[PDB]
Symmetry: D2
Subunit: 309 residues, 4 copies
């Protein structure tokens, strides 16, 4: 590789990605995490939060379409949506493409980070924060949910894995959190979320934990170019099986809502739910359920742990 | 990050993978490429060829099942099979799992590398080289095919990308090479192959390989799968003149899997079928690609990981 | 090791220095070289030129004192001084500390780089560029000297190694360049310069520079000092036709230091003298070296960090 | 840099050396530390102990001549020598070159490591272990010294810096240890040692600690190519000032003892004791003295610490 500026990205405890930085646009520290935003010749702008890549300019459409539309499209008519996380503004951008959306509330803990995105990541938000239907709330998701009582048709959880024992993210991955979320869902409501990278137990544990809160839980996956990783996601609902696709339905909705998709197609979306034998077994055998009493977290070595926070 | 032994693996001109080595099993240089085999805590043994990871002990089953079975299963009764590349022996291993196979010819240019696999990579070959149905040929697959008139039902191409202008392997990625391969296929034959990483923002190797193959075969169908140990989404393809290789029936593939008592750890009939469902961006990249590699102007991979063409010799 | 921003610095073909960057101050590319200036926790601001560290905020005083004072102090009364290179402005700074100096001409080819120093590296120049006695010339030092007939008492050469065959700076390391420099020295003049890293097992750049200078000057004396921020032992040299630059007296240098009220943070009279005492292996390397860089066959540094010669143009 | 096998060497908390490995000769773990021996094109064979380079084939003569001869040459007639550390066998090799040496005892804690050197590092020992005057003892230096009562003309300490709070090396860098060493010195005896890297407080602390045990302590330094570092060393004695060089004396001894030196010369040896203004100030201002009660160690960030072991 060429000499020069590079960022050392943690991927696993045995593999590290060294990404070339052409120029550093912004780097700093908020009261919640460190951030690094740099120009790369391949993926364009890259945002690092702490030690892990958070998003890249040229592949984020894949991640955000994958994260948002399966839940939005499986819901016959989403009017009110709640986004937990998604600080770059792109999750909101995709949510706002559905014409039935009347209100989209985004709740994020780090206001300073959101400001970084607003000023240096216009490629992501593309003016979504200034949409009259959008409402930004800087606060702790649980705190907000515990206080508020408004309900939603769709809730999109776009958070980072609870890696690290002292990581407060642990409290956002417990069965109680998912029940709190479910409490804020209108009848027929669906929840969509990024559920950790998949590599030969974060995703299976999250799937199992969510299943302790919802009747129907369906894992789906997609390779995210800029992360160099296969990521797991899931849809959850008590009102119906979100992955029981009826012939032609998803396709009809995409056309009807005039969604401008660059990555997904109706058939590709449904194919994301077709899982390989090894993943199915991992999901099937998982027994750990994260709880407020004993919140699960991943060790630096990538192991599933559980004990009081 | 920690201190210790690591391997700096080329991925792209802007991204490098630094893999921790627990201990080095073997390293060396054949007249064709450099090789390194080491123990990693996450993926077990890792084989590096020159500057790129070639295979991983703990995830190779995913790569080899993906590479081999779609072609083998789309064929109603594969009896004669040709393997180009696959020096580790795992490709042959998967081919040999099909009881209809009577003969499997494997031709690869680097005999020394094959020897390293035989000695240090039993996890891959699992004895496949010694199968009575297996015939190992160390030679240029192109010279071998022109010098022979044997026919095959299925041909699997398992080679690394042709990096570098001076790389003679460029001649194994031209339209006349694929035409030569097609000339050795029985009437209902099918070719299956690994067709390069997919990273549309960086380069279009996969679409160039697909476009080149389309110039030699009537029906060409790309499929993809994420290879864990490579940290890359890989493209593959099925090609045939006799039929649209992706015009399945989940039912028929399922029945053939059961019939042949195929032991699969990654693929299932429905997942195999789903690999052929592509996203909009990949479809567009495949559709718009115009580069066709030919003996006159063979394509190669530039140090920037881009597909480029230039007159040979 | 930790995750975060780092700079991969070239040191040798087999050793690379990975330096943690706290934050990046400036980075860019002039028509001559790439530059990067960043904050490091250990050495403060670090300036990288292309792929090699050029200077460190916390240790530059060691490098600049070592580079400048031996020549300036061996001269009884340096009034006119020429500086070739030293774009940061710290070389000029040290030259200007000598109150006998009436004029200091600095010629460097990269004006944009000098501008980066002026704006982001005040720790180095400390206002030297604005000294009434300082004259800044942006130009090829060779074209400038041939186009002028001014004379100097001391000449300091502060340039990076000429890496690469196509590097026009190769012409600033030939015997005719040093002869040109000698042609602009007053009768008792002396030339002092940084003469490449010393790493005898890897290459002989320093001995090649010394051997080349010996072909233009009667008396040539190498001296060395370890530069903390470079993690390398560096060679330097003093050259003159008028006297053996190392035929000191600790007493005289001490008196000149006191006389000129030189504020030194690294050197002392006895330490400066000791830099000229070399070990057996270095002496032998210097003695046996036969390579003489000339305009006809200028020497350059190969990608393997070796000194090689080849006919120009 | 080229892709390939590399070793990540800690140097400081902000600088890391990535050294290319052409081939790995041997790698493993003893009950005391990890070891990595590899071929490098520049320095030849390189031995890594834990995370730091211990020695390189093509530059070790510089380190070992620098470590051994100043103490040996400043002693008018060394007959009995004690080496603490120096497991590669090269320290013994240099000591054995002095014809007045009748006995040289080498004490090292890691017998398995010594075996690694014997089998894979012949370039270092060059048969020195098989010299009739050599005696290898595998044991804890202090334990050995506390039990034994034999005395020596010269003691050479070739140990690694006490970096890390739990590092047992701390107990070999206390004023009590140096007093124990001094107790095993014949009258007129001298002690020579590697005293840590020098970089803008390990060396100054060791110098100060040793001075709390010996009347005359003289620091000297030399750049060690293979370490990419300036290293500090020191000579200590109660009988005389080891650095008060009388004209022509060192030179006469080298000739008289027919020493085959490749790096040192009499004038260069004496020049190693000429220190720069900044180093002299650091040595002068240092106030920390390592004690058995509160053994000093260096923090991962390179800071001088002191507390009970």
């Amino acid at each position: 590789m060429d000499y020069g500026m590079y960022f050392f990205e943690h991927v696993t405890p045995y593999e590290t990605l060294v990404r070339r930085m052409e120029r550093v646009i912004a780097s700093g520290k908020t009261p919640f995490q460190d951030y690094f935003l740099f120009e790369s010749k391949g993926f364009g702008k890259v945002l690092i939060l702490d030690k892990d890549v958070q998003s890249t300019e040229r592949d984020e459409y894949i991640y955000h379409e994958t994260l948002v539309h399966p839940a939005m499209l499986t819901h016959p008519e989403p009017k009110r949506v709640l986004i937990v996380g998604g600080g770059e503004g792109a999750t909101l951008r995709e949510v706002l493409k559905h014409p039935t959306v009347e209100k989209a509330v985004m709740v994020d803990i780090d206001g300073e980070l959101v400001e970084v995105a607003k000023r240096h990541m216009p490629e992501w938000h593309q003016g979504a924060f200034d949409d009259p239907r959008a409402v930004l709330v800087i606060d702790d998701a649980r705190a907000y949910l515990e206080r508020t009582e408004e309900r939603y048709d769709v809730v999109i959880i776009d958070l980072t894995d609870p890696v690290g024992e002292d990581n407060p993210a642990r409290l956002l991955y417990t069965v109680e959190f998912y029940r709190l979320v479910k409490a804020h869902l209108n009848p027929g409501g669906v929840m969509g979320m990024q559920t950790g990278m998949i590599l030969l137990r974060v995703h299976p544990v999250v799937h199992r934990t969510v299943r302790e809160a919802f009747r129907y839980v369906r894992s789906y996956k997609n390779h995210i170019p800029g992360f160099f990783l296969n990521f797991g996601f899931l849809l959850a609902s008590d009102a119906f099986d979100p992955a029981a696709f009826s012939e032609g339905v998803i396709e009809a909705r995409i056309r009807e809502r005039n969604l401008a998709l660059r990555h997904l197609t109706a058939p590709y979306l449904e194919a994301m739910f077709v899982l390989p034998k090894d993943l199915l077994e991992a999901l099937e055998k998982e027994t750990m359920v994260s709880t407020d009493q004993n919140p699960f977290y991943v060790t630096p070595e990538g192991e599933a742990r559980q004990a009081p926070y």
